[PDB]
Amino acid sequence: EVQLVESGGGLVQPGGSLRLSCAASGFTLRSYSMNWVRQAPGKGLEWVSYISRSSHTIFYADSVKGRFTISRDNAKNSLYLQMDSLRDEDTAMYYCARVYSSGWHVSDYFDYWGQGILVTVSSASTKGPSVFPLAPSSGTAALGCLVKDYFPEPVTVSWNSGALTSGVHTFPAVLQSSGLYSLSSVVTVPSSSLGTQTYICNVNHKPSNTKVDKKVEPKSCHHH
């Protein structure tokens, strides 16, 4: 398995610095020219920077020209991007991308991509999410979890440790007017199986090492 494993994104304040590194395995990096490609949330693909096998030739897109530095450690089979004076327009998913290598002929289309790491440039701080149940009321009933007030992206929601996938819908996040993200995750289940089967949504939010679970049950009313 040829893989490109990238790491080191995160959240920084405007003007800060980050280094993205992409670790190549199952092939020798020195054989290929390497690119960075990025993507703003819900926008197109923008090419970022190029580097020769030899570290001989580097190119930059005008947006990043004097701020980003592409580099290469072939002995570590790794590709780097230093990102100085980061800005709002730099927030995006960053892809480490391998160009096809033929000798004769030209072929700078992408053979293999990394999975992408996220870079967020914001003045807002890493907050972890509060998780609330969307309780099933009263032959299908729906239930879920409200993952509210976190930063930055992403979270991921599973159900019963991943043992429940059928009929699950995890919604894209929205930015609340407060500047924090919020999303819902829901599942429809047979209502005859309501009071017998336990439902636990497993929320994970890496950017703050917050991992919350929650038992979703219908609300009986023994109060005051």
Binding site: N35, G44, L45, E46, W47, Y50, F59, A61, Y95, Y100, V106, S107, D108, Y109, F110, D111, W113, G114, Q115, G116, S130, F132, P133, L134, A135, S137, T140, A142, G144, L146, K148, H169, T170, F171, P172, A173, V174, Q176, S182, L183, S184, V186, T188, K219, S220, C221
Partner: protein
Amino acid sequence: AIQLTQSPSSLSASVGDRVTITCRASQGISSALAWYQQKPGKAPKLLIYDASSLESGVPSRFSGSGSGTDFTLTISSLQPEDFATYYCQQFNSYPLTFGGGTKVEIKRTVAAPSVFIFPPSDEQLKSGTASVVCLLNNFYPREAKVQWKVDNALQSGNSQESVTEQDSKDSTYSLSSTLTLSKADYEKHKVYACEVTHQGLSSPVTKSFNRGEC
């Protein structure tokens, strides 16, 4: 730089239809074009290089044609899992540039949403804020209206929507609408209603609750 113009931006197309996306270059690039498929979230997958050569492992309904300035990506029989944004890029010269993309959406028969409504959990109310959540479940088309009525008055500019990706089997969406207000404003009222207008429903559907009623 070389600019690439893709037509169209969005596509509606029934399963089994032939779909054709174009990509016009600002200058002759000969055969140096690639097509990619991007499922949202995941990285782009390479479909076609050198204008028309298929990448290994790509189903044959995908085909490339064109030379010099005008190029075409073609899906001869659109499958339900083909929903994706598709990009062309030129490798004639650096900087490498992409088209703006084409969002491909599957057309299917009208399906009315199942509506649900979820009152704020007690825990959330304990922290002084109230989220009411309405669900529209497994519907088509994406076009739906969700109106919030609190004690029978229509709410404006205090709620947000989110739509799932088209489902890769039945081609249906799901929508969540969240109403948000302070524990104070939430406690001034009794009836919380979610009214949904959608093509597959002959007349609006309202799900609702009165505050804390098992």
